[PDB]
Coordinates of N, CA and C in Angstrom, one line a residue:
Chain A
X1 N 117.4 103.8 157.4 CA 116.3 104.3 156.6 C 115.1 104.7 157.4
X2 N 114.6 103.8 158.3 CA 113.6 104.3 159.3 C 114.2 105.4 160.2
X3 N 115.4 105.2 160.7 CA 116.0 106.2 161.6 C 116.3 107.5 160.8
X4 N 116.8 107.3 159.6 CA 117.1 108.4 158.7 C 115.9 109.3 158.4
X5 N 114.8 108.7 158.0 CA 113.6 109.5 157.7 C 113.1 110.2 158.9
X6 N 113.2 109.5 160.1 CA 112.8 110.2 161.3 C 113.8 111.4 161.5
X7 N 115.1 111.2 161.3 CA 116.0 112.3 161.4 C 115.6 113.5 160.5
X8 N 115.3 113.2 159.2 CA 114.9 114.2 158.3 C 113.7 114.9 158.8
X9 N 112.7 114.2 159.3 CA 111.5 114.9 159.8 C 111.9 115.9 160.9
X10 N 112.6 115.3 161.9 CA 113.0 116.2 163.0 C 113.8 117.4 162.6
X11 N 114.6 117.3 161.5 CA 115.4 118.5 161.1 C 114.5 119.4 160.3
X12 N 113.7 118.9 159.4 CA 112.7 119.7 158.7 C 111.9 120.5 159.7
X13 N 111.4 119.9 160.7 CA 110.6 120.5 161.8 C 111.4 121.7 162.5
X14 N 112.6 121.4 162.9 CA 113.3 122.5 163.6 C 113.7 123.6 162.7
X15 N 114.1 123.3 161.5 CA 114.4 124.4 160.5 C 113.2 125.2 160.1
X16 N 112.1 124.5 159.9 CA 110.9 125.2 159.6 C 110.5 126.2 160.7
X17 N 111.0 126.0 161.9 CA 110.7 126.9 163.0 C 111.6 128.1 163.0
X18 N 112.5 128.3 162.0 CA 113.4 129.4 161.9 C 114.0 129.8 163.3
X19 N 114.7 128.9 164.0 CA 115.0 129.1 165.4 C 115.9 130.3 165.6
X20 N 116.7 130.8 164.6 CA 117.5 132.0 164.8 C 116.8 133.3 164.7
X21 N 115.5 133.3 164.4 CA 114.7 134.5 164.2 C 113.8 134.8 165.4
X22 N 114.0 134.1 166.5 CA 113.2 134.3 167.7 C 113.6 135.7 168.3
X23 N 112.5 136.4 168.8 CA 112.7 137.7 169.4 C 113.6 137.6 170.6
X24 N 113.4 136.5 171.4 CA 114.1 136.2 172.6 C 114.7 134.8 172.4
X25 N 116.0 134.8 171.9 CA 116.7 133.5 171.8 C 117.1 133.1 173.2
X26 N 116.8 131.8 173.5 CA 117.2 131.2 174.8 C 117.7 129.8 174.6
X27 N 118.8 129.7 173.8 CA 119.4 128.4 173.5 C 119.7 127.6 174.7
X28 N 120.2 128.2 175.8 CA 120.5 127.4 177.0 C 119.3 126.6 177.5
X29 N 118.1 127.1 177.3 CA 116.9 126.4 177.8 C 116.6 125.2 176.9
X30 N 117.3 125.0 175.8 CA 117.1 123.8 175.0 C 118.1 122.8 175.3
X31 N 119.1 123.0 176.1 CA 120.1 122.0 176.4 C 119.5 120.9 177.2
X32 N 120.0 119.7 177.0 CA 119.6 118.5 177.8 C 120.8 117.6 177.9
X33 N 121.7 117.8 178.8 CA 122.9 116.9 178.9 C 122.6 115.5 179.1
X34 N 121.4 115.1 179.5 CA 121.1 113.7 179.6 C 121.0 113.0 178.2
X35 N 120.9 113.8 177.2 CA 120.8 113.3 175.8 C 122.2 113.1 175.2
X36 N 123.2 113.3 175.9 CA 124.6 113.2 175.4 C 124.7 111.8 174.7
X37 N 125.4 111.7 173.5 CA 125.4 110.5 172.8 C 126.3 109.5 173.6
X38 N 126.0 108.2 173.3 CA 126.9 107.1 173.7 C 128.1 107.0 172.9
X39 N 127.9 107.1 171.5 CA 129.0 106.9 170.6 C 129.1 108.1 169.6
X40 N 130.3 108.4 169.2 CA 130.6 109.3 168.1 C 132.0 108.9 167.5
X41 N 132.2 109.4 166.3 CA 133.5 109.2 165.7 C 134.6 110.2 166.2
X42 N 135.6 109.6 166.8 CA 136.6 110.5 167.4 C 137.8 110.7 166.4
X43 N 138.0 109.8 165.5 CA 139.1 109.9 164.5 C 138.7 109.1 163.2
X44 N 139.2 109.5 162.1 CA 139.0 108.9 160.9 C 140.2 109.1 159.9
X45 N 140.4 108.2 159.0 CA 141.4 108.3 158.0 C 140.9 107.7 156.7
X46 N 141.0 108.5 155.6 CA 140.5 108.1 154.3 C 141.6 107.5 153.5
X47 N 141.7 106.2 153.5 CA 142.6 105.4 152.5 C 141.7 104.8 151.4
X48 N 140.7 105.5 151.0 CA 139.7 104.8 150.0 C 140.3 104.5 148.7
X49 N 141.4 105.1 148.3 CA 142.0 104.7 147.0 C 142.5 103.3 146.9
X50 N 142.9 102.8 148.1 CA 143.4 101.4 148.2 C 142.6 100.5 149.0
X51 N 142.3 100.9 150.3 CA 141.6 99.9 151.2 C 140.3 100.3 151.7
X52 N 140.1 101.5 152.1 CA 138.8 101.9 152.7 C 139.0 103.1 153.7
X53 N 138.0 103.3 154.5 CA 137.9 104.3 155.5 C 138.0 103.7 156.8
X54 N 139.0 104.1 157.6 CA 139.2 103.6 159.0 C 138.8 104.7 159.9
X55 N 138.3 104.3 161.1 CA 137.8 105.3 162.1 C 137.9 104.7 163.5
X56 N 137.8 105.6 164.4 CA 137.8 105.2 165.8 C 136.5 105.8 166.5
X57 N 135.8 105.0 167.3 CA 134.7 105.5 168.1 C 135.3 106.0 169.5
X58 N 134.5 106.9 170.1 CA 135.0 107.5 171.3 C 135.3 106.5 172.4
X59 N 134.9 105.3 172.3 CA 135.2 104.3 173.3 C 136.6 103.5 173.0
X60 N 137.3 104.0 172.0 CA 138.6 103.5 171.5 C 138.5 102.2 170.7
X61 N 137.2 101.8 170.4 CA 137.1 100.8 169.4 C 137.4 101.4 168.0
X62 N 137.9 100.5 167.1 CA 138.2 101.0 165.8 C 137.4 100.2 164.8
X63 N 137.2 100.8 163.6 CA 136.5 100.1 162.5 C 137.1 100.5 161.2
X64 N 136.7 99.7 160.2 CA 137.1 100.0 158.8 C 135.9 99.6 157.9
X65 N 135.6 100.5 157.0 CA 134.6 100.2 155.9 C 135.5 100.0 154.7
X66 N 135.7 98.7 154.3 CA 136.5 98.3 153.2 C 135.9 98.7 151.9
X67 N 136.7 98.9 150.9 CA 136.2 99.2 149.5 C 135.3 98.1 149.0
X68 N 135.4 96.9 149.5 CA 134.5 95.8 149.0 C 133.1 95.9 149.8
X69 N 132.9 96.9 150.6 CA 131.6 97.1 151.3 C 131.5 96.2 152.5
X70 N 132.6 95.5 152.9 CA 132.5 94.8 154.2 C 133.0 95.8 155.3
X71 N 132.7 95.4 156.6 CA 133.1 96.2 157.7 C 133.7 95.3 158.8
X72 N 134.8 95.7 159.3 CA 135.5 95.0 160.4 C 135.6 95.9 161.6
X73 N 135.2 95.5 162.8 CA 135.3 96.3 164.0 C 136.1 95.6 165.0
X74 N 137.0 96.3 165.7 CA 137.8 95.7 166.7 C 137.4 96.5 168.0
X75 N 136.9 95.8 169.0 CA 136.5 96.4 170.3 C 137.6 96.9 171.1
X76 N 137.3 97.7 172.1 CA 138.4 98.3 172.9 C 139.2 97.3 173.8
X77 N 138.7 96.1 173.9 CA 139.5 95.1 174.6 C 140.7 94.6 173.7
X78 N 140.8 95.1 172.4 CA 141.9 94.7 171.6 C 141.8 93.4 171.0
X79 N 140.8 92.6 171.2 CA 140.7 91.2 170.7 C 139.4 90.8 170.1
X80 N 138.3 91.4 170.6 CA 136.9 91.0 170.1 C 136.7 91.7 168.7
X81 N 136.1 91.0 167.8 CA 135.9 91.5 166.5 C 134.4 91.3 166.1
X82 N 133.9 92.2 165.3 CA 132.6 92.0 164.6 C 132.8 92.3 163.2
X83 N 132.4 91.4 162.3 CA 132.6 91.4 160.9 C 131.2 91.5 160.2
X84 N 131.0 92.4 159.3 CA 129.7 92.6 158.7 C 129.9 92.6 157.2
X85 N 129.3 91.6 156.5 CA 129.6 91.5 155.1 C 128.6 92.4 154.3
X86 N 128.8 92.4 153.0 CA 127.9 93.3 152.3 C 126.5 92.9 152.3
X87 N 126.2 91.6 152.2 CA 124.8 91.1 152.3 C 124.2 91.4 153.7
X88 N 125.0 91.9 154.7 CA 124.5 92.1 156.0 C 124.8 91.0 157.1
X89 N 125.4 89.9 156.6 CA 125.8 88.8 157.6 C 126.8 89.4 158.6
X90 N 126.5 89.2 159.9 CA 127.4 89.6 160.9 C 128.0 88.3 161.6
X91 N 129.2 88.5 162.0 CA 129.9 87.4 162.8 C 130.7 88.1 163.9
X92 N 130.9 87.3 165.0 CA 131.6 87.7 166.1 C 132.7 86.7 166.3
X93 N 134.0 87.2 166.5 CA 135.1 86.3 166.6 C 136.2 87.1 167.3
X94 N 137.4 86.5 167.5 CA 138.5 87.2 168.1 C 139.7 87.2 167.1
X95 N 140.5 88.2 167.2 CA 141.8 88.2 166.5 C 142.6 87.0 167.0
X96 N 142.6 86.7 168.3 CA 143.5 85.7 168.8 C 143.1 84.3 168.3
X97 N 141.8 84.1 168.0 CA 141.4 82.8 167.4 C 142.1 82.6 166.0
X98 N 142.8 83.6 165.4 CA 143.5 83.5 164.1 C 142.5 83.0 163.1
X99 N 141.5 83.8 162.7 CA 140.6 83.4 161.6 C 141.3 83.5 160.3
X100 N 141.4 82.3 159.7 CA 142.1 82.2 158.4 C 141.4 83.1 157.3
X101 N 140.1 83.2 157.3 CA 139.4 84.0 156.3 C 139.6 85.5 156.4
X102 N 140.2 86.0 157.6 CA 140.2 87.4 157.8 C 141.5 88.0 158.2
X103 N 142.6 87.3 158.2 CA 143.9 87.8 158.6 C 144.3 89.0 157.8
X104 N 144.2 89.1 156.5 CA 144.5 90.3 155.7 C 143.8 91.5 156.2
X105 N 142.4 91.3 156.4 CA 141.7 92.5 156.8 C 142.0 92.9 158.2
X106 N 142.2 91.9 159.1 CA 142.7 92.3 160.5 C 144.0 93.1 160.4
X107 N 144.9 92.6 159.6 CA 146.2 93.3 159.5 C 146.0 94.8 159.0
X108 N 145.1 95.0 158.0 CA 144.8 96.3 157.5 C 144.2 97.2 158.6
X109 N 143.2 96.6 159.3 CA 142.6 97.3 160.4 C 143.6 97.8 161.5
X110 N 144.6 96.9 161.8 CA 145.6 97.2 162.8 C 146.5 98.4 162.2
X111 N 146.8 98.4 160.9 CA 147.5 99.5 160.3 C 146.8 100.8 160.5
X112 N 145.5 100.8 160.2 CA 144.6 102.0 160.4 C 144.7 102.4 161.9
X113 N 144.6 101.4 162.8 CA 144.5 101.8 164.2 C 145.8 102.4 164.7
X114 N 146.9 101.9 164.2 CA 148.2 102.5 164.6 C 148.4 103.9 164.0
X115 N 148.0 104.1 162.8 CA 148.0 105.4 162.2 C 147.3 106.5 163.0
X116 N 146.0 106.1 163.4 CA 145.2 107.1 164.1 C 145.7 107.3 165.6
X117 N 146.2 106.2 166.2 CA 146.6 106.4 167.6 C 147.9 107.2 167.7
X118 N 148.7 107.3 166.7 CA 149.9 108.1 166.8 C 149.8 109.5 166.3
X119 N 148.9 109.8 165.4 CA 148.9 111.0 164.7 C 147.7 111.9 164.9
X120 N 146.5 111.4 165.4 CA 145.3 112.1 165.3 C 144.8 112.4 166.7
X121 N 144.2 113.6 166.9 CA 143.6 113.9 168.1 C 142.2 113.2 168.3
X122 N 141.7 113.1 169.5 CA 140.4 112.4 169.7 C 139.3 113.5 169.8
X123 N 138.4 113.5 168.9 CA 137.3 114.4 169.0 C 136.5 114.1 170.2
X124 N 136.0 115.2 170.9 CA 135.2 115.0 172.1 C 135.9 114.4 173.2
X125 N 137.3 114.6 173.3 CA 138.0 114.0 174.4 C 137.6 114.6 175.8
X126 N 136.9 115.8 175.8 CA 136.5 116.4 177.0 C 135.1 116.0 177.5
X127 N 134.6 114.9 176.9 CA 133.2 114.5 177.1 C 133.2 113.0 177.6
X128 N 132.4 112.8 178.7 CA 132.1 111.5 179.2 C 130.8 111.1 178.5
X129 N 130.8 110.1 177.6 CA 129.5 109.8 176.9 C 128.4 109.4 177.9
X130 N 127.2 109.2 177.4 CA 126.2 108.7 178.2 C 126.4 107.2 178.5
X131 N 125.7 106.8 179.6 CA 125.9 105.4 180.0 C 124.8 104.6 179.3
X132 N 125.2 103.6 178.5 CA 124.2 102.8 177.9 C 124.6 101.4 178.3
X133 N 123.9 100.5 177.7 CA 124.0 99.1 178.0 C 125.3 98.7 177.4
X134 N 126.5 99.0 178.1 CA 127.8 98.9 177.6 C 128.1 97.5 177.0
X135 N 127.0 96.8 177.0 CA 126.5 95.5 177.1 C 125.8 95.2 175.8
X136 N 125.4 96.3 175.1 CA 124.7 96.3 173.9 C 125.5 96.6 172.7
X137 N 125.0 96.3 171.5 CA 125.7 96.4 170.2 C 126.5 97.6 170.0
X138 N 127.8 97.4 169.8 CA 128.6 98.5 169.2 C 128.1 98.8 167.8
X139 N 127.8 100.1 167.5 CA 127.4 100.4 166.1 C 128.6 100.3 165.1
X140 N 128.3 100.3 163.8 CA 129.4 100.3 162.8 C 129.0 101.4 161.8
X141 N 130.0 101.9 161.1 CA 129.8 102.9 160.1 C 129.1 102.3 158.9
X142 N 127.8 102.8 158.7 CA 127.0 102.3 157.6 C 127.3 102.9 156.2
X143 N 127.6 104.2 156.2 CA 128.0 104.9 155.0 C 128.7 106.2 155.4
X144 N 129.4 106.8 154.4 CA 130.0 108.0 154.6 C 130.2 108.7 153.3
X145 N 130.4 110.0 153.3 CA 130.7 110.7 152.1 C 131.3 112.1 152.5
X146 N 132.0 112.7 151.6 CA 132.6 114.0 151.8 C 132.0 115.1 150.9
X147 N 131.9 116.3 151.4 CA 131.6 117.4 150.5 C 132.8 118.3 150.6
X148 N 132.7 119.5 149.9 CA 133.8 120.4 150.0 C 133.9 121.0 151.4
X149 N 132.9 121.0 152.2 CA 132.9 121.6 153.6 C 132.9 120.6 154.7
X150 N 132.6 119.3 154.5 CA 132.5 118.5 155.7 C 132.6 117.0 155.3
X151 N 132.7 116.2 156.3 CA 132.6 114.7 156.1 C 131.3 114.3 156.9
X152 N 130.6 113.4 156.3 CA 129.3 113.0 156.8 C 129.4 111.5 157.1
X153 N 129.1 111.1 158.3 CA 129.3 109.7 158.8 C 128.0 109.2 159.4
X154 N 127.5 108.1 158.8 CA 126.2 107.5 159.2 C 126.5 106.2 160.0
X155 N 126.2 106.2 161.2 CA 126.4 105.0 162.1 C 125.1 104.1 162.0
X156 N 125.4 102.8 162.2 CA 124.3 101.8 162.2 C 123.3 101.9 163.3
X157 N 123.5 102.7 164.4 CA 122.5 103.0 165.4 C 121.6 104.2 164.9
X158 N 121.7 104.6 163.7 CA 120.9 105.7 163.2 C 121.5 107.1 163.4
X159 N 122.7 107.2 164.2 CA 123.3 108.5 164.4 C 123.9 109.0 163.1
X160 N 124.0 110.3 162.9 CA 124.6 111.0 161.8 C 125.6 112.0 162.3
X161 N 126.8 111.9 162.0 CA 127.8 112.9 162.5 C 128.3 113.7 161.2
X162 N 128.5 115.0 161.4 CA 129.0 115.9 160.4 C 130.1 116.7 161.0
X163 N 131.3 116.5 160.4 CA 132.5 117.3 160.9 C 132.8 118.3 159.8
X164 N 132.8 119.6 160.3 CA 133.1 120.7 159.3 C 134.6 120.9 159.3
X165 N 135.2 120.9 158.0 CA 136.6 121.0 157.8 C 137.2 122.3 158.2
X166 N 136.5 123.4 157.8 CA 137.1 124.8 157.9 C 137.3 125.2 159.4
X167 N 136.3 125.0 160.2 CA 136.4 125.5 161.6 C 136.4 124.4 162.7
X168 N 136.4 123.2 162.3 CA 136.5 122.0 163.2 C 135.2 121.9 164.0
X169 N 134.1 122.5 163.6 CA 132.9 122.3 164.3 C 132.2 121.0 163.9
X170 N 131.4 120.5 164.8 CA 130.9 119.1 164.5 C 129.5 119.1 165.0
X171 N 128.6 118.3 164.4 CA 127.3 117.9 164.8 C 127.2 116.4 165.0
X172 N 126.6 116.0 166.0 CA 126.2 114.6 166.2 C 124.7 114.5 166.4
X173 N 124.0 113.9 165.4 CA 122.6 113.9 165.5 C 122.1 112.5 165.8
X174 N 121.2 112.4 166.8 CA 120.6 111.2 167.2 C 119.1 111.1 167.0
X175 N 118.6 110.4 166.1 CA 117.1 110.4 165.8 C 116.3 109.7 166.9
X176 N 117.0 108.8 167.7 CA 116.2 108.1 168.8 C 115.9 109.1 169.9
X177 N 116.8 110.0 170.3 CA 116.5 111.0 171.3 C 116.0 112.3 170.7
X178 N 116.0 112.4 169.3 CA 115.6 113.6 168.6 C 116.5 114.8 169.2
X179 N 117.8 114.5 169.3 CA 118.7 115.5 169.9 C 119.8 115.7 168.9
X180 N 120.6 116.8 169.2 CA 121.8 117.2 168.4 C 122.8 117.7 169.4
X181 N 124.0 117.1 169.3 CA 125.2 117.6 170.1 C 126.1 118.5 169.1
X182 N 126.4 119.7 169.6 CA 127.1 120.6 168.8 C 128.5 120.8 169.5
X183 N 129.6 120.6 168.8 CA 130.9 120.9 169.2 C 131.4 122.1 168.5
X184 N 131.7 123.2 169.2 CA 132.0 124.5 168.6 C 133.6 124.6 168.3
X185 N 134.0 125.7 167.8 CA 135.5 125.9 167.5 C 136.3 125.8 168.8
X186 N 135.7 126.1 169.9 CA 136.5 126.1 171.2 C 136.4 124.7 171.8
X187 N 135.9 123.7 171.1 CA 135.7 122.3 171.6 C 134.8 122.2 172.7
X188 N 134.0 123.3 173.0 CA 132.9 123.2 174.0 C 131.7 122.4 173.4
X189 N 131.1 121.6 174.2 CA 130.1 120.7 173.7 C 128.8 121.0 174.4
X190 N 127.7 121.0 173.6 CA 126.4 121.2 174.2 C 125.4 120.3 173.5
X191 N 124.5 119.7 174.2 CA 123.6 118.7 173.7 C 122.2 119.3 173.8
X192 N 121.4 119.4 172.7 CA 120.1 120.0 172.7 C 119.1 119.0 172.2
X193 N 117.9 119.2 172.8 CA 116.7 118.5 172.3 C 116.1 119.3 171.1
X194 N 115.9 118.7 170.0 CA 115.5 119.5 168.8 C 114.1 120.1 169.1
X195 N 113.3 119.5 169.8 CA 111.9 120.1 170.0 C 112.0 121.3 170.9
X196 N 113.0 121.3 171.8 CA 113.2 122.5 172.7 C 113.8 123.7 171.9
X197 N 114.7 123.3 170.9 CA 115.3 124.4 170.1 C 114.2 125.1 169.3
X198 N 113.1 124.4 169.0 CA 112.1 125.1 168.3 C 111.3 126.1 169.2
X199 N 111.1 125.7 170.5 CA 110.5 126.7 171.4 C 111.4 127.9 171.6
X200 N 112.7 127.6 172.0 CA 113.5 128.6 172.6 C 114.5 129.2 171.6
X201 N 114.7 128.7 170.4 CA 115.6 129.3 169.4 C 117.0 128.9 169.7
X202 N 117.9 129.5 168.8 CA 119.3 129.3 168.9 C 120.0 130.4 168.1
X203 N 121.4 130.4 168.2 CA 122.2 131.3 167.5 C 122.3 131.0 166.0
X204 N 122.7 132.0 165.2 CA 122.8 131.8 163.8 C 123.7 130.6 163.4
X205 N 124.8 130.5 164.1 CA 125.8 129.4 163.7 C 125.2 128.0 163.8
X206 N 124.6 127.7 165.0 CA 123.9 126.4 165.0 C 122.7 126.3 164.0
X207 N 121.9 127.3 163.9 CA 120.8 127.3 162.9 C 121.4 127.0 161.5
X208 N 122.4 127.6 161.1 CA 123.0 127.4 159.8 C 123.5 125.9 159.6
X209 N 124.1 125.4 160.7 CA 124.6 124.1 160.6 C 123.5 123.1 160.5
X210 N 122.4 123.4 161.1 CA 121.2 122.4 161.1 C 120.5 122.4 159.7
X211 N 120.5 123.6 159.0 CA 120.0 123.6 157.7 C 120.9 122.7 156.8
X212 N 122.3 122.9 156.9 CA 123.2 122.0 156.2 C 123.0 120.6 156.5
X213 N 122.7 120.2 157.8 CA 122.5 118.9 158.2 C 121.3 118.3 157.5
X214 N 120.2 119.0 157.3 CA 119.0 118.5 156.7 C 119.4 118.1 155.3
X215 N 120.1 119.0 154.6 CA 120.6 118.7 153.2 C 121.3 117.4 153.2
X216 N 122.2 117.1 154.1 CA 123.1 115.9 154.1 C 122.2 114.7 154.4
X217 N 121.3 114.8 155.3 CA 120.5 113.6 155.6 C 119.6 113.3 154.4
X218 N 119.1 114.3 153.7 CA 118.4 114.2 152.4 C 119.2 113.4 151.4
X219 N 120.5 113.8 151.3 CA 121.4 113.0 150.4 C 121.6 111.6 150.9
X220 N 121.7 111.4 152.2 CA 121.9 110.0 152.7 C 120.7 109.1 152.4
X221 N 119.5 109.6 152.6 CA 118.3 108.8 152.3 C 118.2 108.5 150.8
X222 N 118.6 109.5 149.9 CA 118.4 109.3 148.5 C 119.4 108.3 147.9
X223 N 120.7 108.3 148.4 CA 121.7 107.4 148.0 C 121.3 106.0 148.4
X224 N 120.9 105.8 149.7 CA 120.5 104.5 150.2 C 119.4 103.9 149.3
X225 N 118.3 104.5 149.2 CA 117.2 104.1 148.3 C 117.6 104.4 146.8
Chain B
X1 N 140.4 117.1 153.0 CA 141.3 116.4 154.1 C 141.1 114.9 154.0
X2 N 142.4 114.1 153.9 CA 142.6 112.7 153.8 C 142.4 112.1 155.3
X3 N 142.5 113.0 156.4 CA 142.3 112.4 157.7 C 141.7 113.5 158.7
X4 N 141.1 113.0 159.9 CA 140.6 113.9 160.9 C 141.8 114.7 161.5
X5 N 141.4 115.8 162.5 CA 142.4 116.7 163.1 C 143.5 115.9 163.8

């Protein structure tokens, strides 16, 4: 909510600057590879009719947002878990500890994990994420929704990812860095500081996707509240 | 789409 309103302001500001109408567009001068995200969604699978939405983060951790609004996350060590209930209660445990209260959901999570590992490509596989406190909280998927053109994924660290179905382009927006990472059709990745994009401008494709992004963040804030 | 690429 705090991070989302900040994201909305940052997007309203860049779009208000009409970055694609600059007489001298200099997109490259808005890049800042130091702002590369730590986390993004590399895979997802929509089983919402029965169980929920499963996903994998670029660090090979997996998570599930169950239909009952709980979330279960399995770290990339294959054993550490974080469970978040609908009221917000979080717990840390291990699969190997055999938690009686969670074996069904662990089994479902493992089903999701095996589906994605065998069938799906890893988004951003050509990217080494930024170095953070590898030591600090793994985010979880706070909410998601689909439109006819994209899937919108909102992470608990405030990031918002939008994957476009038609051309496989993707945006990863981070309100903490006020940055956007754009993955184009050719899977080339560029990270921009939004404030620099306002000075230097950008191409019509990125400008259009950023207008769409503002609309989706607007929808995210409205549904939350 | 029911799943990513």
